Amino acid sequence: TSSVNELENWSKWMQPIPDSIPLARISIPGTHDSGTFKLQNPIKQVWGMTQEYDFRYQMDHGARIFDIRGRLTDDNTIVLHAGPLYLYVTLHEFINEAKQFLKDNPSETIIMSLKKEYEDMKGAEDSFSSTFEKKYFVDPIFLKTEGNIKLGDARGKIVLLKRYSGSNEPGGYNNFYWPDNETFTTTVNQNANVTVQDKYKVSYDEKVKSIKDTMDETMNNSEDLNHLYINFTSLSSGGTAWNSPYYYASYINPEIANYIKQKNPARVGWVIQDYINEKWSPLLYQEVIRANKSLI
Ligand SMILES: O[C@H]1[C@H](O)[C@H](O)[C@H](O)[C@@H](O)[C@H]1O
Numbered sequence: 001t002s003s004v005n006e007l008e009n010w011s012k013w014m015q016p017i018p019d020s021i022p023l024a025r026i027s028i029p030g031t032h033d034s035g036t037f038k039l040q041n042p043i044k045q046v047w048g049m050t051q052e053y054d055f056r057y058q059m060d061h062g063a064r065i066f067d068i069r070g071r072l073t074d075d076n077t078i079v080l081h082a083g084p085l086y087l088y089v090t091l092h093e094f095i096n097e098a099k100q101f102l103k104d105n106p107s108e109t110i111i112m113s114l115k116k117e118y119e120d121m122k123g124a125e126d127s128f129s130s131t132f133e134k135k136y137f138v139d140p141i142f143l144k145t146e147g148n149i150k151l152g153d154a155r156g157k158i159v160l161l162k163r164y165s166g167s168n169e170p171g172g173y174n175n176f177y178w179p180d181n182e183t184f185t186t187t188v189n190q191n192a193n194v195t196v197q198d199k200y201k202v203s204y205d206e207k208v209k210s211i212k213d214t215m216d217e218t219m220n221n222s223e224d225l226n227h228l229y230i231n232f233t234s235l236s237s238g239g240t241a242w243n244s245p246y247y248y249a250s251y252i253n254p255e256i257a258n259y260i261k262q263k264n265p266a267r268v269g270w271v272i273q274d275y276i277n278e279k280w281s282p283l284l285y286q287e288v289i290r291a292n293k294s295l296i
Pocket of ligand 1 (some may be wrong): 180198236
């Protein structure tokens, strides 16, 4: 008993997908720079703000991947940053919002990308990777198994995507070489391959063209269960209302939403977008979620 109807519930949309499907096969929405939603100062906004609603809102609109950027403080906690900007959000804060969401919707999983976003503060006693793994990761809410992670094992857990070096604890997707401002393909673990389009800081026209190109490769490779396709629709700021990430997102999100509607693909990858909201139609995350219809 599973139906495409259940894909319309953005809060439980992973429920009808068979537990045996690998997460990499599933088309999943994500948020880029997920924790920038408390910024108010206007200069901070045009340069660094990428979301306007809190974590629970993002999850309730179907996002399951979260781009968590951390900094180690002098009291040995990890807080959220966007470049050099403090975000007034802590790492525990996000995990607790994830915990609450997973308790309310135990059919779902949360994929958390963690990256070290800025140099450690001098007063800290340990390294970023060690602090994160000893004080946050050993928590049982994080799934500790590896391989080509299946949804069934991830339900009710947080699945870590390591974008930091130094890991000593198994679990999640291993760190891998992530060249700056490129589209690239490498290995995740033995037997799993990954393709990432992260051309931030590129002309608008090259950005849209790279989103579509990499989605095309996902589309035409829909039944390769081992290959991760990660597609950042976000674009870095130019410093003004004419090129902030808000301006760009107000055009790219519906542009890419139409592209999916138009192509009715069986797979579109892990689409990480700025400003998930209800302002621009068609809704990108909605079209990404519906692209899983063929899995039911
Ligand atoms: O400058 C950052 C950084 O280089 C990250 O690696 C990338 O993922 C983008 O978010 C970009 O904004």
